[PDB]
Amino acid sequence: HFYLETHCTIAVPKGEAGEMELFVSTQNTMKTQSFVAKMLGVPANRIVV
Amino acid sequence: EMGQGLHTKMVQVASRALKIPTSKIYISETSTNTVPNTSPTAASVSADLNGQAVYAACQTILKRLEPYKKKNPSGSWEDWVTAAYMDTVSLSATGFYRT
């Protein structure tokens, strides 16, 4: 692809109920949210991308 | 937005739907907590699909402003907006579209 901006992700934990905010250079916010939620084992409502 | 100017188009689309300058409309970011279960921005249909959802949301708004536009046709968009708020009318709406 050679997009001038390579892949990047900033994960910021909130400390409460497993809440986590992620700044991601992605075209798929939805799958990012769920894949991170499945990995952490928390409901999707705790993860905002 | 990844450089294809998707937002520009959406702002244009919305600007035409509400009949207000693009200068009054702003798009900041894409977020899973404002619009959920979104499909990936791919298959070249992001403007087709979203432009349609943005359109729908706009129609919902126009619909609610109608009453105030009729009581003051010579009025501006700002006049109708504050009249609507002053008269406890929701000024927020979602929009959805599926092929």
Place this chain on the structure above:
Amino acid sequence: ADKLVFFVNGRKVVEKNADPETTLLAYLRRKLGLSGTKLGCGEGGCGACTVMLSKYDRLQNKIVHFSANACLAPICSLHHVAVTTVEGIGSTKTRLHPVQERIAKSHGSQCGFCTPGIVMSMYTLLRNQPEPTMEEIENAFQGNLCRCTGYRPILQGFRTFARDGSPSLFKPEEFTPLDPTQEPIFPPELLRLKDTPRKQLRFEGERVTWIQASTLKELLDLKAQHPDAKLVVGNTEIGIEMKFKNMLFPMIVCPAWIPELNSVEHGPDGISFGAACPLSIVEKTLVDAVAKLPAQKTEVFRGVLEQLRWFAGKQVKSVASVGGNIITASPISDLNPVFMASGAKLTLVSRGTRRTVQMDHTFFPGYRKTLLSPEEILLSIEIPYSREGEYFSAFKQASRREDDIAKVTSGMRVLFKPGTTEVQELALCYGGMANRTISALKTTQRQLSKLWKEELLQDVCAGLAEELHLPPDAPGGMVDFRCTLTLSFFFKFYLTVLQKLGQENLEDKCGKLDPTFASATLLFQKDPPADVQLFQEVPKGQSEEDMVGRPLPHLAADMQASGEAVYCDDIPRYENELSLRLVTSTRAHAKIKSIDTSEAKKVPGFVCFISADDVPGSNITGICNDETVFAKDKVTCVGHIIGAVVADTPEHTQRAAQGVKITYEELPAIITIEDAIKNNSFYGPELKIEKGDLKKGFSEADNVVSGEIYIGGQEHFYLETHCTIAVPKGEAGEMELFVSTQNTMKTQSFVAKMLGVPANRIVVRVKRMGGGFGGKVTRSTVVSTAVALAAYKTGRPVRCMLDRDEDMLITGGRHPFLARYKVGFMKTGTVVALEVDHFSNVGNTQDLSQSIMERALFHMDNCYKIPNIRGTGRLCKTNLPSNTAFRGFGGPQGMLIAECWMSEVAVTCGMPAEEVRRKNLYKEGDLTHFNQKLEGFTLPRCWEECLASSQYHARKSEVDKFNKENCWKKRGLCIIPTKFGISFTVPFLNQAGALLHVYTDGSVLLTHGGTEMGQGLHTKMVQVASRALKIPTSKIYISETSTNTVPNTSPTAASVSADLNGQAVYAACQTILKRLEPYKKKNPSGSWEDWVTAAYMDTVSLSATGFYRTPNLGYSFETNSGNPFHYFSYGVACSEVEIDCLTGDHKNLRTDIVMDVGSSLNPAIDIGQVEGAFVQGLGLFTLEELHYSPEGSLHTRGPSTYKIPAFGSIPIEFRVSLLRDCPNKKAIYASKAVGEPPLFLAASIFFAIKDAIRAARAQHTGNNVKELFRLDSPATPEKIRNACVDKFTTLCVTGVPENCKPWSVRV
């Protein structure tokens, strides 16, 4: 020297360049990232920063544990100490500790800002006393404050730790058991460092050099070479000086490690205490001594113990040294008056020199001075044993009993010649009656050889009033009250000695002791608490997953107790974030002639100073486009924001602000409500509601009474002050702000207007507030715009969290009220006509003034029907900081006024107050004075239900009986009803929005316009959403309130937020259900996840907004028609009090509340709201008071001088019950609002007090059962004592010339 090493939660910390000015609280939050420990005052009076300190005592050879205020602890004094923060004992990430679990599950945590601190105080207690008594548990929270809970739940929950051991709000049987062997180990590393000998250490900060002396020689040689060098032990005095009195001691020396200064010797004349000995040790040593020795040898010891009983709190007493209290020489020291009267022996040492002196009046030369030479240091003090025929008493009286500054404090001693009753020695020493600790020499000397009888009492009182009399302009004020106390104290001493002589069988050579006088000698004591909560059970067949009506605890309670809950300032700073501090006016009204930055520019980390000239948009802001963002050309109140200073650290902004020189040209200023009335200075016209015919009314009236009353203001004192973090995005003017605010919408538009950018560019995020109570409905924008401008100016993120002193000064609070009334009534009690003119001091901007005065006018009737009524109000424009909304929004003022004249109507009719009130009550279907219909009038049930609950009549006899048996203590019993209109007076604010998303995994993310400030709103909203969607609350989450998820929201106020948003949330749920219908039908036996997945894949929107607006609202003062409210809240409370006719102190014995909250959404939350509201009302009417100088400058700027309700201020027996079977068709799920309504019910304590004062007056001054004396609010100990006119106050009453400039004047 050099390296500072200590521990934090087991982890070792190595600070190579420790700054002597760095506090522990500053190091923890800003260096270690432990946000659990909060900043509530930096004054040592709130305990929100409480932590536990553990160290190896090289003296006793043991590991010791104690609590301390991290805001006063210099890390430089923590070398080789182990710190334990809230996050150090447990957390939801692992396992919560019993302390955390119980306070959480017991509903003892609302906003949660004070939880960590409470938890740490309870936790520390349990560490030293594994099975404490209830008394010990409450005693551990003397230095802890909570503004939300009302305390009861906290104590009720912890009662389970005590060895003193309708459904319920919680299940104590379910608390996990406490295993004290599972507590964190004392760092083994510290134990190994105990063998390396101690050596002097030197730390060098930006401006202070700190020297940790290891030996007495080092201390002495240092002080002899650098007499200026400041000694510091507990730092609870010097820490205040540096931070608040802006002092700087370039060289500090800490002697705490020196063993000679920590020794405790038991000698033949008494017990000497090393000068560095913390007050906790003096106390510990003395209590053990008083238990072991003869009572006759411990009279003085008991006096010192009585004082320490009311000396600060545990945190301060654990670090504050006895020598520290002495040398400070504060005129209000509670110990010096005692050490002086008993002539404690002080050993003073200098390098080479050594002397001893027994403290007397000469030991205190002048203000804050002592007899020590510059090279001398106090080595130790000897507290004397008592001799035969020698007695000692100690006294103290302030505004509040716990952790407070004494108004008058004293130590009285007397020596009788052997076997006789003739005075050989007499010493009456006082604090708070002059320049410093003094002795009533002239008066005592004259009593020598006199027999202890009536003649001596009369002569002593007369002498003290003359010899200690204070001038009308004396600093601090309240001269009369203060003098009265010096005589009143002696009277108690006098009486006490008669009893003690009676023990010697000399009760014949001394004055007679009247049986009714006896109770006057008793030391404060209180029965065990009796707290019961009654509420309704949910329908027998209600789904177990339906939480509506169930006592589900506050959703964030666990994380609030574990310190994990994140508040604004707890959010990590960006690597490039800056700190901001506001520069404010020091003039009530004047022209700004110039502003000099010269000195600010010289502070390290200084970035810039912004002002009105930096605003790119509009400098006009405020709800009424009344004020400036930054003052321009003029300042209109002491506190008027002129500009801001930007720097890298809070410490640096402090110094920078101090460096902005400002010269003014003063202009005439209007301060008092009287100044306004006199200068015709108001905001808008007079407001008025009139109904009936006054002229005809007063003419048919048998009697007519005229009167006046003043209701003081109030500071919100939310444990978390104002705070705003603004992060500029650098694109198109976008800015993101994290704000502690009840009003996201006005914050967004106020910042937008200021920056001159569209609202769509500004997003305001609120996760939670450490309290709001109305104080953050508008005044919060004041800090937001300033921080916003700094971020816009620097392009960097910036934050600012006001210190308590800035907050109290700048943000203002509840509106002070002055009212004049005229009530016309018959001899049967029926009131026929009523005229009331209200006046409110609003300040330098109109803010919400008008709306507040209207609600006041809407409740000038309370629950009484008056056919002919006229009420008017005026908004007084004054040069004070602008007041604003405070829980009640005007209602509490208007209603207290009504109960005022109503209490008089009864007294005048010679009829029982409950009867007079009962008969003047509205009935189902009546119209109010503003013509609204009272439907669902449940007040009558509450009244009858409360009378039975409290057994009002049966106890009315108990009260008379106690008053007949006691002369210097009286009791009062009073029952008060209330009616509160629910909904915003501004109709269009009665609207709300919600945004609901359902993800493909089934989990739901919900948001609405309401902000969480501890009222459990999110908890309720999740509950509502759960029920509507028919899914478990565990599948629904609410993260935050944001202007970009739900726009145009009303502030979270007026108590309707649960009504409005719960309705919008409901609307959103229905939209989702209606869309899921098709799939539910095709698969009935399917699960929620099944339907969501199906709906998603059939391309159906799983996101919906919800909206709601209350219908048919709108009042018109013109035609006096239309409904202002959607429905009313009802409640009744009965309260019994006991006052000390000699000090002004009082106990809240019992309070019974019956509240109508309709079908409660959450009875755990509502009872906590009732309790919390009532306790704030308790503070509004009896403890809280703000003093302003004659020139409009606020004197009260912190918990030290502003005393809000403490744990011990709540009613011993506290009974709260929710009215059963009373569904409210007018609100979500038949519930009712409850936030504000309860607060006024505290008025029952106000009138019970007046009832007692009535009793006291009727006895100590002939009589006059029809007498109508005035008692203003708050009814503080000064007002209560002065009201109790007796032979003592008669001698205490100062004149007040014309030219007199008093310390403070009533606003």
Place this chain on the structure above:
Amino acid sequence: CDDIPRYENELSLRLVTSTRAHAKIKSIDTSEAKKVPGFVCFISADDVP
């Protein structure tokens, strides 16, 4: 994404990838990484919650 300022406590991450096309992971040693200045930790599959 990466232009977004770092928080004062923000850390950097870097993936550790396979140098073989197909093989069994016999073992993983972190002795050297632990010696690197500012090293916080190494996470692997054993860490996913």
